[PDB]
Symmetry: C4
Subunit: 506 residues, 4 copies
């Protein structure tokens, strides 16, 4: 039957369904079963009111418990190509306790499973046990952790918020892995320029057990069994073609400039915030500063951080500045040097995160106050965490929408891992401090003002500094273009254009 | 379809429906749609039990969410002449979070809206964001704030409670704005005396963008496009007539007396009480005193007030006296100099206001205790905030009813703004410290004992001190008369009669 | 229609219905309507499972709100002979807030009411306001207060618990008031001995406005309009008969002995416990002691007592001894001088009384522990408050049942006041410190060992010390006999017999 | 009708039904009635989804209250052979309050009861009152207390966890009591070897009132009326046969070695944990140590222990070491000398035990952390309490399953006591510090390496040290064998085999 089975119901369900319908469109639609401990008629009424085009995919609703075999058989658990275990809204520990029981129940199905299980986890500290019992069947996506990592990357490089929104999920272009036997024996540097409608980003190496290698060496020779990872518009829109001849050349300014220290403000004590501090410390230049403004008394912060595993005496690049106050009170915020921050993250505070409507209400209040304080004393990059995807969609035609990053990104990640489990490893690397990550790079590294050249020609220059070029954003365009059309056509570039690459760090 | 759409359900719904039915009576009835996340049959049963005459208006109930387009279309959202977003009973922040999402949902309706949106807000600090996202579509009525402002005005001038109850809502007389081309070129001083059945209070000035000017200069010449604001019995009961000839004269005692300091007691720590203190400080004579009796420790009060934006070192007219205790405990209240207060406001305390039945129970207890303490030590104007309109109506044949001001006034304000959005600006000015407000004035300013004259004759005397005369209360009448009949008829007035005017301050 | 209407639903409803069915049996049954905000079919199912004989009374159930006129008319509110407003189980203030709204709703019925309203109040401090708004329509029965007063009387005189249980409610004998014109002109001393099947206890005096005078002077001459209060088996079982001739005589030991001091223990901090302390102080001999064992810190007790209106420096007869601890912890109870108490009251503590099952569980635990501590250190009168009548009935064949006084007594009081509102004044006096009360008296006051005489003969001796004799308990009988049969028959009495009288104090 | 009646619904119901179906299988099935205050159709749907073979037993569901006679008659309460009163999940005191009311209701059934009542109690301190009111009808099983006692025995002797799981409940072998007249006059030492398919463990002695004597003297002569207690596979699988001739001999190493001190860690403050400390102190060798790691401040622990009746100055064998911290925080656990503990019990903490899913989630976290801390610092017997039987079953194919003891054992105990009430006394003795208990004993006490002999021959050697031999575990077997087949067959034993006996202590 090879349908997608979703176990549970949450605020993320509608956007997850949408993503799966987009992914299935190239098939002419598929089948999604949703099983939840709710009345079947209510579920059907709610699905019937969703406002997105199902694109030929049909959704079936059943009432039942994922711990009850009789209920799992109502939805053909053992024939599904993927099973997605949705987190419950609310308390992260309760949700993760249910996730663990569900995974145990699924691993107990005696007929076995055809597909893999994608588990939406809410707290990183609960992941090890779920992975331990789920073995080779389970992929975990730790939603809270992912969102923190994305907020940091977008704080560091603002234009990335639009790029990540484009790449995640199934609108526009995303990652695909597929076997191309006619490419065996090719060097990766030729594979790179072999697909008119795609960009190769890495290789699934068969002699490594199927391990995905992002940004491999140009001299890697594809072996029998290897597959190519690409960015492409859909699973069936791209294929290799005879090699174009691409003019070669040199980089004009292949330099590394000393990265400048950054000053970042975290508003709110986010659950597990030490995990963000660790990521930040491994991402910023030395002598950077992290300001934490929140209502936890300073005396007690060190205890919270050390119990979550952070040694604040071994931080390498950031110093911590603590300030105490209420992020919705004007008078407390105005004592901050707001104008001095390179970026400000407004985080859902651990004391209210169990109610998305209350957390989101506070984050939006804080946003407005910060803007107004600054405006009123004037004779900045702000990112706000939003927990309910419906509130993000509701904001979409508001200016405020530029200042928000939502759990819709979690639904997009869940759908990608549901469609190909190995994409979890790709996104894990790109979200991690180690290994490859996305960067927006000035044009004067790659070309001189007005130089007439093709996307492929820039791509080969970018390989001299060990980057995979995936797109660009022209000087006065509002959106970057990922996986551009007509990669052999030439144009005159500007030093105000910028390029999007996959690269290792310094 | 041009019906009124009400989104939500609350303790105020019945009185709002009543007001809209009164407003619609002159049409022979209209249509009200009510959509709420409740069972349709329950809604219909509850509506069917309301005890007021629907006067030809028909009410339709639908079950649905205002965030769900499919549900908004069930009630013809885009054809309604007005949409009213009712606050949820309970916690003000939760209610305002829902109001914001609803406004975003409504502004997303792609067919657009024919009418405006009236949003019942529960907390002033949440208003800016709703106004920001609702743009030109939204009028906000901040219920909590309005009630505080009305309680202060009635504490300052007790007879105003009956006048405001009369003017608000659609029983008796209220404000109407309408275009009268045959009055172009007239001076406002002639317009004032041109309507046998109405009193002009201001002009919508077309050269100002449609801005409403209350109490304009007598020499203002009405221009093409201007409209007249009046107090009248209904939208269709009044029209201009040939000018009466009105005898002119002088004021006998056009004096200003030094306003005397007042001593006011606030019982309870009302949410956002600094907003009332600000209003009070701009309303009382110098060397006045505000006593605050409530259970918040004195040490901590200053912090609450400064965080809500009140600088208590810049108060101009009042000194603050703090007393700590429980307003339902006899022994604590009896240490207050109760007999010395010009007025006492019993306020719904922020610690219980999320339960109207609990708040109202405490306010009534405090009322009884204050009366009894004073009576028992005897060998005063009290105003009590009541949150459930049903409790006010239940009290109506009790003596206690003179001591109460309720959220029914909010339903009356919501209906007025629903019927003409520009009435929000009129009421905002009259509730504000700035600009015009209502005053009850002694007769010896305007006339001598037994002087025989008409209402219009007094009105023109009142214009010499830049007042609009809207009514009077005779010496032994229990009710003031607003917009009196037969304004040209003469009678003999008494120095114990009083007059109701719209005026600027000192 | 002259039915009983009960508004609400509670743990007391079944026992109230039972009492009304008993009261109605002599009519051949009546009608009770019950209206509650519950599903009608559930109500009917619950009524159908009650285990007591309805004795020809029919019960009708309707679903509705007592605040909604349409609902009050479903149950013929204006034709009922009585309306009983049942308290809600749980928090006393919430229940009393609902009682007040209900009374206002009932006083608003424009057709008026045929009968009176009996209001079950939960907190004495809320009674004044309900009485103020209910005027002449309302009788209040303050359940919590009544139970405290009964527990004290039974602690002082243990045999009274059985007597009060007999007299309250409609099993056995109770109070009736009725007009007997053929008795006009009789002296009260002859009226006393005029009813073979009843005992006159007082007169409703028409020249006093219908005021009930308990235990009037023997020389009072019944005037036209007066009615007689009696204890009798039912409203129709008694009538006056020609005067018997009763031998007169003297009292052998008409003495007053010095009342001995008592030591009483209160376990638990009962809500409003200062009201019990006041009653106790006016009831005990001088140099008595009240021990209060409970978890409130001693420092804070004085504040609680003074805020409830008790001045502990003006106590006349008792000294207060405070001990702090947990009444369910053996080790804390064993530090008390348990063997020294004349009586011990186990009270439902204010911290758990909102859950009757939790309060009753603690009171029974404490009971068991006190018994066991004493038994285990041995090489006492205990009274335990029980809040759910079902738990009292469940205990009935247990020995523990002698140690319990329950809210069933409240249902019995409510039914008595429902049947004749003037019985509220009778019970108020008998429960009050002032005026008449019930006493169990040794036989040697009235007679010598083996003296052969009739009940009437003892009754006339008792009048020489201004007592109304209502019954007796023979030397080895387990139950007292109230309103005995055959009052003229003689028997030989024992100095170990005891007599039950109504009397004023010392 | 002689069915089993179960009153209530809980997380234990499915496993209790399973056990009763196993017990009934030898009859061809029986009848179980389940009555709960739930909708009948929901109950039936849930029963219909249980995954275990009902083996011919039929289950009937009814909706009703055990306090309501009409409801008790729907399920033929007075004809049931047993009534089981299931605890409610959640708060132990609430559950026990309901148990007490139910027992009173059952003892009030005027037709009487045919069978006994088994009451699942949640707190030991509540047991006395239930036993007091239930008299001879009631058997109590205090679930919390039993589980603590089993965890201690399994900590002391790890192989016992598998043995107890085998013996409890009705899979494999369990206890049966039955009268065998043909054995009157036999010595108990011959009775011991008289049943090919059973092992006699004791005698119900008729001259003692039916008291069960475990491990009686070999010289006891069975008298008329006595019955034999055995371990056997089912009630009908065993019978006596002519005496086998068993070779006699001596024990080679009938020694007692000095028991070595043990170091035990308790993680979590379990409700009533003083009851476990008492058991532990009477079970361990002198100079043993009990470490308690939990979040209760050390200052306050002594108060908790003394109020629960533990005098820590009279402990005979253990010293207490207190450590404060959070058992789910790695950094706190790693300060413990984890490698030094003979066993570690992870206990459901009293602060979360009212939610089984939250308690079990913490216990599993702690388990994982302890393992990982030890593994990571390496250049142990752990027992974890699990409150929901479904979580134990879900863990069953996980390695983690060796580290868990669950409330399924309570369902097994309830079913055993339901089937024969006298088994409660047998298990009470075996769980108690006093009297007989189970022990795993080295082979070199009983035999020499390679000695060829039968199970009966070892059994008679074991009687010389006053042990009843019930089974063995061979050197490389994963499971012990209880009540072995073919007890007269010989084999060659190894010094690495071990024997399971019932014995008194030192
Ligand atoms: Ca696709
Ligand atoms: Ca965590
Ligand atoms: Ca795509
Ligand atoms: Ca109108
Ligand atoms: Ca506010
Ligand atoms: Ca009107
Ligand atoms: Ca009667
Ligand atoms: Ca009180
Ligand atoms: Ca009677
Ligand atoms: Ca069997
Ligand atoms: Ca306990
Ligand atoms: Ca078995
Ligand atoms: K994409
Ligand atoms: K009006
Ligand atoms: K009676
Ligand atoms: K077994
Ligand atoms: Mg962590
Ligand atoms: Mg403010
Ligand atoms: Mg009081
Ligand atoms: Mg104990
Ligand atoms: Na990376
Ligand atoms: Na104003
Ligand atoms: Na009295
Ligand atoms: Na034992």
């Amino acid at each position: 039957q090879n349908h997608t089975l979703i176990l549970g119901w949450s605020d993320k369900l509608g956007s997850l369904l949408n993503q799966l319908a987009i992914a299935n469109e190239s098939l002419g639609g598929g089948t999604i079963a949703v099983m939840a401990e709710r009345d079947k008629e209510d579920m059907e009424l709610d699905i019937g009111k969703m406002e997105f085009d199902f694109k030929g995919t049909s959704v079936i609703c059943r009432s039942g418990s994922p711990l009850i075999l009789a209920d799992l058989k109502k939805v053909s658990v053992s024939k599904a190509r993927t099973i997605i275990v949705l987190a419950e809204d609310g308390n992260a520990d309760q949700s993760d306790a249910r996730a663990l029981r569900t995974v145990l129940s699924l691993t107990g199905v005696k007929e076995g499973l055809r597909g893999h299980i994608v588990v939406e986890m809410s707290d990183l500290d609960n992941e090890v046990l779920v992975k331990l019992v789920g073995g080779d069947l389970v992929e975990t996506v730790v939603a809270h952790d992912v969102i923190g990592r994305l907020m940091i990357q977008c704080a560091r490089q603002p234009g990335l918020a639009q790029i990540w929104e484009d790449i995640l999920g199934f609108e526009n272009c995303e990652f695909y892995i597929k076997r191309w036997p006619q490419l065996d024996g090719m060097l990766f540097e030729d594979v790179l320029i072999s697909f008119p409608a795609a960009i190769p980003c890495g290789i699934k190496v068969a002699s490594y057990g199927g391990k995905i290698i992002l940004n491999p060496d140009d001299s890697y020779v594809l072996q029998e069994g290897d597959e190519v990872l690409v960015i492409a518009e859909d699973d069936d829109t791209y294929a290799p073609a005879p090699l174009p001849m691409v003019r070669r050349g040199s980089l004009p300014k292949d330099f590394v400039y000393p990265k400048s220290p950054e000053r970042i403000l975290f508003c709110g004590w986010r659950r597990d915030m030490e995990d963000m501090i660790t990521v930040l410390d491994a991402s910023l230049a030395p002598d950077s500063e992290l300001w934490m403004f929140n209502d936890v008394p300073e005396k007690e912060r060190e205890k919270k951080l050390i119990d979550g595993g952070l040694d604040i005496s071994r931080l390498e690049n950031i110093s911590l500045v603590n300030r105490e106050g209420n992020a919705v009170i004007r008078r407390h915020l105005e004592s901050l040097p707001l104008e001095s921050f390179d970026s400000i993250l407004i985080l859902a505070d651990e004391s209210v995160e169990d109610s998305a409507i209350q957390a989101d209400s506070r984050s939006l209040a804080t946003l407005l106050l910060i803007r107004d304080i600054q405006a009123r004393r004037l004779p900045t990059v702000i990112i706000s965490e939003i927990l309910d995807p419906r509130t993000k969609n509701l904001l979409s035609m508001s200016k405020i929408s530029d200042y928000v990053l939502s759990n819709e990104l979690v639904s997009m990640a869940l759908a990608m891992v549901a469609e190909d489990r190995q994409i979890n490893d790709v996104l894990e690397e790109l979200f991690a401090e180690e290994g490859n990550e996305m960067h927006i790079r000035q044009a004067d590294i790659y070309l001189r003002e007005g130089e007439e050249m093709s996307f492929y020609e820039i791509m080969l220059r970018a390989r001299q500094r060990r980057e995979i070029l995936i797109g660009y954003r022209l000087a006065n365009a509002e959106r970057a273009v990922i996986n551009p059309p007509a990669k052999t056509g030439r144009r005159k570039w500007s030093l105000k254009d910028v390029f999007v690459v996959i690269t290792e760090k310094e």
